[PDB]
């Protein structure tokens, strides 16, 4: 009750310093105003072509302008999943004591925890009509995705759903930060050497999580057990994602993690 | 998940900055 107190703070700053897009900024672009040049709406194949085209900035002379689209969208998300994975790695090594764990172990904690964490925050930028893409610049409509030729139309629908209820809980960045730290720091990951320091460590996060959640949303007494359940709805959402995504490694196999993720991958960080 | 520790192990070493 001293160092375990500034522990919650230190984890909120880690978040308010490693995530380019949080819920407040995110909530103002969506519901917002004070800017009359809102996100660019991607509501169909034509607009999705402009979007994805300028995005890879090697596609207004080259040729990537009309292949099945269902598989074009499966590209941006990657030119958006290196950014995403690194901020969660910095934010994590900014988590008190996390930098301790033997590196080899720090890879294990972020490897199985990465996806749960993403979808958790992914909820900050979503709303019942569509999510925000590209740092708040564009806004892809929910409908447009569930219309793509199967089995695509069912990749983003499970997440949107989970997020509509998760956003009902009404957390904020101070909450989300702890929540997200607690999913990284979970000692039930396969191959952990010091499978005990991670728990000791984790007890703090979840302990502050409970206390912060009592004096932050004092009227959802069962909000904490609620969130302990979500930490579960998410380990199983990723699980199903992993599946649905593999009808795309075997079948589609044109745009995979070919050894082309490297042209920017090395000399960059 | 799956193994992308590639990208994650490189963001592990290559920064500098801290309050
Ligand atoms: C490689 C292993 C793996 O599967 N890892 C999980 C990795 C995790 C992830 C998911 C979503 C996300 O938000 C991305 C938000 C986002 N940003 C844009 C965007 C569009 C146009 C222009 C600019 C941006 O669109 C979206 C949905 C960020 C990261 N998903 C990857 C690589 C791809 C997918 O999950 C995916 C999603 C949808 C489709 C579909 F549209 F065809 F259905 C396909 C694949």
**Which residues of chain A does B5 touch, with a Cβ-Cβ cutoff of 8 Å?**
107, 111
**A5: Cβ contacts below 8 Å, ≥ 6 apart:** A208
Q: Domain range holding A210?
A: 1-269
Q: B13 CA to chain A: closest CA distance, Å? A: 8
**Residue given tokens 């995005």 in the structure block:** A55
Residues 6+ positions from A243 with CB-CB distance below 8 Å: none
A262: Cβ below 6 Å to ligand 1? no
Pair of tokens at residue A116: 């749960």
Q: Which of B5, B11, B19 sits opposite A111 (nearest CB)?
A: B5
Q: Which of A216, A205, A224, A184 is nearest to A101 (CA)?
A: A184
State the nearest Cα–Cα gap between A127 and chain B, in angstroms.
25
Question: Do the chains contact at B7 and A106, CB–CB below 8 Å?
Answer: no
Residue B11 DSSP SS3: coil
In three-state secondary structure terms, A34 is coil
How many whole angstroms separate alpha carbon A131 and alpha carbon A136?
9
Q: Are the C-beta atoms of A111 and B1 separated by less than 8 Å?
A: yes
Experimental method: X-ray
Whole-number Cα distances in Å, A143 to A51, A123, A156, A253: 17, 17, 10, 26
- Judged by a CB distance cut-off of 8 A, whether residue A109 touches chain B is no
What span, in angstroms and rounded, lies between the C-alpha atoms of A58 and A64?
8
CA distances from A72 to A23, A103, A246, A252 (A): 27, 35, 16, 12
Q: Quick check: helix, strand or coil at residue A41? A: strand
CA distance A260 to chain B (A): 13
Query: Which residues on B lie below 8 Å from A90 (Cβ)?
Result: 11, 15
The DSSP bridge partners found for residue A103 are none
What contacts 24+ positions apart, CB below 8 Å, involve A61-69?
A: A68/A149, A69/A45, A69/A148
- Asked if A115 is an interface residue toward chain B (Cβ–Cβ < 8 A), one would say yes
The answer to whether A105 and A116 have CB atoms below 8 angstroms apart is no
Please give the Cα distance from A208 to A9 (Å, whole number).
10
* H or E element in which residue B10 lies: helix B5-10
Cα-to-centroid distance, B12 and ligand 1 (Å): 23
Alpha-carbon distance of A53 to A34, in angstroms, equals 28
Among residues A208, A211, A189, A207, the alpha carbon closest in space to that of A198 is found at A189
Rounded distance between C-alpha atoms, residue B13 and residue A69, angstroms: 36
- Helix or strand or coil: residue A131? strand
Residues 6+ positions from A178 with CB-CB distance below 8 Å: A8, A11, A12, A205, A208, A209, A212
**Tokens read off for A138:** 């564009």
User: For chain A, where are the alpha helices, taking DSSP H only?
Assistant: 6-15, 23-30, 45-55, 73-76, 83-92, 103-111, 114-122, 142-145, 156-166, 173-184, 197-212, 223-233, 235-245
Give the number of domains in chain A.
Answer: 1
A265 neighbourhood in chain B, CB within 8 Å: 7
CATH number for the domain including A174? 1.10.565.10
Please state, in angstroms and rounded to a whole number, the distance separating the CA atoms of residues A157 and A142: 8
Q: Is the CB of A52 under 6 A from ligand 1?
A: yes
Strands A138-141 and A40-42: what pairing?
parallel
DSSP state of A136: G
């Amino acid at each position: 009750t001293a160092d375990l107190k500034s522990l919650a703070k230190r984890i909120y700053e880690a978040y308010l310093k490693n995530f380019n897009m949080n819920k407040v900024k995110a909530r103002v672009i969506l519901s917002g105003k004070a800017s009359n040049n809102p996100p660019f709406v991607i509501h169909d194949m034509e607009t999705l072509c402009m979007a994805e085209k300028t995005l890879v900035a090697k596609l207004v002379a080259n040729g990537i302008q009309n292949k099945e689209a269902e598989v074009r969208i499966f590209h941006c998300c990657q030119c958006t999943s290196v950014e995403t994975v690194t901020e969660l790695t910095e934010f994590a090594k900014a988590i008190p004591g996390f930098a301790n764990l033997d590196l080899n172990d720090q890879v294990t904690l972020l490897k199985y925890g990465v996806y749960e964490a993403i979808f958790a925050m992914l909820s900050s930028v979503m709303n019942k009509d569509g999510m925000l893409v590209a740092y708040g610049n564009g806004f892809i409509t929910r409908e447009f995705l569930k219309s793509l030729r199967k089995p695509f139309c069912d990749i983003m629908e499970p997440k949107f759903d989970f997020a509509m209820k998760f956003n009902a809980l009404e957390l904020d960045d101070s909450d989300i930060s702890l929540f997200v730290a607690a999913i990284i720091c979970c000692g039930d990951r396969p191959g952990l050497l010091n499978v005990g320091h991670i728990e000791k460590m984790q007890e703090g996060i979840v302990h502050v999580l409970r206390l912060h959640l009592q004096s932050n949303h004092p009227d959802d007494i069962f909000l904490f057990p609620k969130l302990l359940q979500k930490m579960a709805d998410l380990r199983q959402l990723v699980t199903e994602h992993a599946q649905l995504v593999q009808i795309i490694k075997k079948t589609e196999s044109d745009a995979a993690l070919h050894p082309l993720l490297q042209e920017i991958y090395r000399d960059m960080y | 998940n799956m193994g992308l520790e590639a990208i994650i192990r490189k963001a592990l070493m290559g920064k500098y900055d801290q309050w």
